[PDB]
């Protein structure tokens, strides 16, 4: 009878924009409601909860959520998305007067504001003696995404965002590699739609 629903396993928000993570519940009588956050290889931390007191509930770091009985909702919001907000978020509800039941979770991806993109594909060499290298696609903005490989002997990773605090500078990248003789960095990302102005050094 009682459930909790988060839709979207993975969602995006622009750096600086309103954060909104949705949760709905199915209990007839209003339940208690909880939002938890989890960082990589860490446990669960309570952000805020509705415990039949205030309907506008406030949490740490500018999070809030409003309990809305008429739309059976408890959406989590934060006014501005920061790169440190990247995490998995779980909505949860009281059930059967004896437990908390958890939603399936939503991972929040923060898209960095890349004002001066500089898309490029670089070749990197093994620090030890090597016929061995990898290819690094880097410095593209939010409109580029990386596709999986078409060749089973070429490996391509998902794009990853790094935040260099020393220079207050964020950048996207993906890595490709292969154990093949005819593998060149010029062809590594041919299954991806890359910027027309991508830099290919020779």
């Amino acid at each position: 009878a009682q459930s909790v629903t988060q839709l979207g396993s993975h969602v995006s928000v622009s750096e600086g924009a309103l954060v909104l993570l949705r949760c709905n519940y199915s209990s007839s009588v209003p339940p208690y409601l909880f939002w938890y956050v989890q960082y990589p290889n860490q446990g669960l931390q309570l952000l805020l909860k509705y415990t039949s007191a205030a309907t506008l509930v406030k949490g740490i770091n500018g999070f809030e959520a409003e309990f809305k009985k008429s739309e059976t909702s408890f959406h989590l919001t934060k006014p501005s998305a920061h790169m440190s907000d990247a995490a998995e978020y779980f909505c949860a509800v009281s059930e059967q007067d004896d437990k908390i039941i958890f939603g399936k979770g939503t991972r929040l991806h923060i898209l960095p504001n890349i004002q001066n993109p500089d898309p490029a594909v670089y070749q990197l060499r093994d620090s030890k003696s090597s016929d061995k290298s990898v290819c690094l696609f880097t410095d593209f903005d939010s409109q580029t995404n990386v596709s999986q490989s078409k060749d089973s002997d070429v490996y391509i990773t998902d794009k990853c965002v790094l935040d260099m605090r020393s220079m207050d500078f964020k950048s996207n990248s993906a890595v490709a590699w292969s154990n093949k003789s005819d593998f060149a960095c010029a062809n590594a990302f041919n299954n991806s739609i890359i910027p027309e102005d991508t830099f290919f050094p020779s």
Partner: protein, 240 residues
């Protein structure tokens, strides 16, 4: 810690009985065992309101529990199978839904321990073309040929762990995706200013903690016994 769990990491072969232990200090009546899986959140296995009071959750099949004391709640995998690979969390609650979670047990169940294998780890040095174009320098670490998927990658600069400038893939990829026991690969990037990479005094190391076999486990192959261990690769800065 009020709530403690043991073990923290464990690898087991299929068909073994495995026991996870939760202990608390506040003596709350209510204790719980949950599992976490990607896309499914936390699912309740079993819960208990007092010593010898036991209640099934949504996924109790293949598990048993015992409430040995006010302070202790034990979870058993009765005969471990691979789909019991998960992150397990115990919790306590007060009488007003105030939950306290343990820090978790990462458990991997594999069919054949002969397939266990530590990673090979390599560091790839920054491109001269990146350095010239951007005045930044990206190092890449690649950890390959490992099994199971039960590692922790970190970066170390002049002997101290760094988090800034780092991005590590959230999951490893399968090297042979059509195989149930494929080995895995994982990449990570560390980006620094070009001036910092150009200093030959600076030392950069990628560290992979691998969880594998214990001293107790039998090993019949000629190749190295694939025990829990650290595998690193390193590079020194260099001028141009």
């Amino acid at each position: 810690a009020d709530v403690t769990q043991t073990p923290r990491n464990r690898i087991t072969k299929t068909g073994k009985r495995i026991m996870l232990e939760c202990s608390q200090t506040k003596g709350h009546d209510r204790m719980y065992w949950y599992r976490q899986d990607p896309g499914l959140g936390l699912r309740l296995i079993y819960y208990s309101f007092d010593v010898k009071d036991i209640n099934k959750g949504e996924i109790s099949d293949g598990y048993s529990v015992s409430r040995q004391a006010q302070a202790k709640f034990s979870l058993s995998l009765e005969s471990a199978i691979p789909n019991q690979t998960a992150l397990y969390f115990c919790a306590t609650s007060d009488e007003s839904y105030g939950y306290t979670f343990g820090s978790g047990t990462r458990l991997t169940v594999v069919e054949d321990l002969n397939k266990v294998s530590p990673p090979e780890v390599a560091v790839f040095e920054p491109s001269e073309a990146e350095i010239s174009h951007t005045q930044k320098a990206t190092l890449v670490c690649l950890a390959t040929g490992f099994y199971p998927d039960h590692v922790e990658l970190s970066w170390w600069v002049n002997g101290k762990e760094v988090h800034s400038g780092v991005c590590t893939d959230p999951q490893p990829l399968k090297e042979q995706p059509a195989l149930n026991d494929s080995r895995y690969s994982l990449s990570s990037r560390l980006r620094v200013s070009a001036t910092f990479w150009q200093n030959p005094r600076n030392h950069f190391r990628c560290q992979v903690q691998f969880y594998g076999l214990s001293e107790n486990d039998e090993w019949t192959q000629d190749r190295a016994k694939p025990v829990t261990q650290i595998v690193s690769a390193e590079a020194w800065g260099r001028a141009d």
